[PDB]
């Protein structure tokens, strides 16, 4: 609307898109570590054997 609130409601949808996109790009930085253990436990037989 160009009024004082409809300038602001734009900014609230920007911060969500920013902090939605900051999480999922960081998720592959976390999904990398989760991809370690489920193929390192394809190998690595136990120490007792």
């Amino acid at each position: 609307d160009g009024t004082g609130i409809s300038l602001h409601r734009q900014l609230r949808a920007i911060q969500q898109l920013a902090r939605n996109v900051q999480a999922v790009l960081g998720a592959f930085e976390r999904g990398t570590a989760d991809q370690m253990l489920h193929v390192l436990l394809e190998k690595a037989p136990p120490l007792a054997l």
Partner: protein, 47 residues
């Protein structure tokens, strides 16, 4: 018919200029001319 011409005016407008943009959003209430009423309320108690 005293004359045949008169003197009207134009619209005065009322826009959320300053503090009313915060009080409508951060709070709920948005009391009109709060730039002036807040000036008058801060002028009375200090004497």
């Amino acid at each position: 018919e005293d004359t045949e011409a008169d003197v009207p005016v134009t619209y005065g407008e009322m826009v959320l200029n300053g503090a009313n943009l915060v009080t409508a959003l951060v709070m709920g209430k948005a009391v009109r001319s709060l730039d002036d009423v807040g000036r008058h309320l801060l002028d009375m108690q200090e004497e």
